[PDB]
Symmetry: C2
Subunit: 199 residues, 2 copies
């Protein structure tokens, strides 16, 4: 009392497959202050341009003439890559917008670590990475003080050209939840408490 | 989050005690292009607007029922993308609408993040601050071959935001993170203002029938 600053986050374990760089026990991974993740940098920050510094939109409009669109080589490559990146960025933007509207309590897919609910689940995820030839360095146990969301990636909007309003319905179903094999979103303060296996 | 309850409401045992301190009442000016309005007409704003419908709901497919993305992918072969006629028109209109929908989605997301109090561009009505401003918007509409049927005076009970549209993300292919920065500038944004208005809207005067 007579005081000024007088004034949701739980403690739990999760399992994480390391691919990028090896983690050590006691390592902190902060997603408590809206830090951007690798997924954000990849779909929101990077871009591809042709040799003249033009992006997909610029190239498409430069070439649309006589109601015909004839693009080749690097120009076609830049247009397609631009479309693939942007539809994927739109996906994350729509999903994030839906979370802010109706599910503000869950971690953002743009500001979280991706993990599994159990070791068994981590092993199943590992089996999928392997069948895809995705290098796995470790499987690690994390202690979290923050929040999580168990999601079904299958429920996310697709990389198709359907109307945004239909993509919004899909994001809504994603956030409502499934069952299958969950992708856990986690945020807050994350500590590596154990290296289960070091491949 | 927390909100202040009025002393007057304490002790009552009703559930819906919402409402007032945040309402404004003001006049605005509106360019009518869709259908003529009349004196004393009321408009309601949890509702999507025409911009949401045209950018988010509407779509154009080819004769085979394919959207712009499917057409793009199924024509990208051995380093060539050769599209003709209706297929080309569909891809172009798809890209056109989609970069606009993306702009509106990014701007809405940022509004939700930082300015949740302002009206949404996806449900609001658009207005001019003064009759003088409405006239300049009108000349702009005439230049771009979109006929204005009326300039009407509105009385609003609700809220508004005075925005500078030049600050919105553009219809170009820059990275979304840069479009997000632009959306922040927009919502902060100190020209010829475009007012966003929501709440209870009433036509109190038809200044111009054209």
């Amino acid at each position: 009392l007579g005081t000024e600053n007088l004034y949701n986050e739980t403690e739990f374990y999760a399992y994480h497959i390391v691919t990028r760089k090896k983690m050590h026990i006691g390592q902190m991974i902060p997603f408590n202050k809206n830090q951007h993740n690798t997924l954000y940098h990849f779909f929101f920050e990077r871009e591809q341009l042709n040799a003249n510094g033009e992006d997909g939109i610029q190239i498409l409009n430069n070439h649309y003439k006589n109601d015909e669109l004839h693009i080749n080589n690097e120009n076609a490559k830049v247009v397609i890559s631009y479309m693939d990146q942007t539809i994927r960025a739109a996906r994350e933007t729509i999903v994030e917008m839906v979370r802010l509207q109706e599910f503000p309590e869950y971690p953002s897919r743009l500001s979280c670590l991706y993990a599994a609910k159990s070791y068994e689940d981590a092993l199943k995820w590992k089996a999928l990475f392997d069948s895809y030839n995705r290098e796995v360095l470790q499987i690690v146990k994390l202690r979290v003080i923050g929040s999580s969301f168990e999601g079904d990636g299958n429920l996310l909007p697709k990389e198709d050209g359907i109307p945004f309003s239909q993509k919004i319905e899909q994001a809504r179903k994603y956030w409502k939840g499934n069952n299958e094999l969950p992708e856990l979103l986690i945020n807050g303060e994350i500590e590596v408490v154990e290296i289960i296996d070091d491949f």
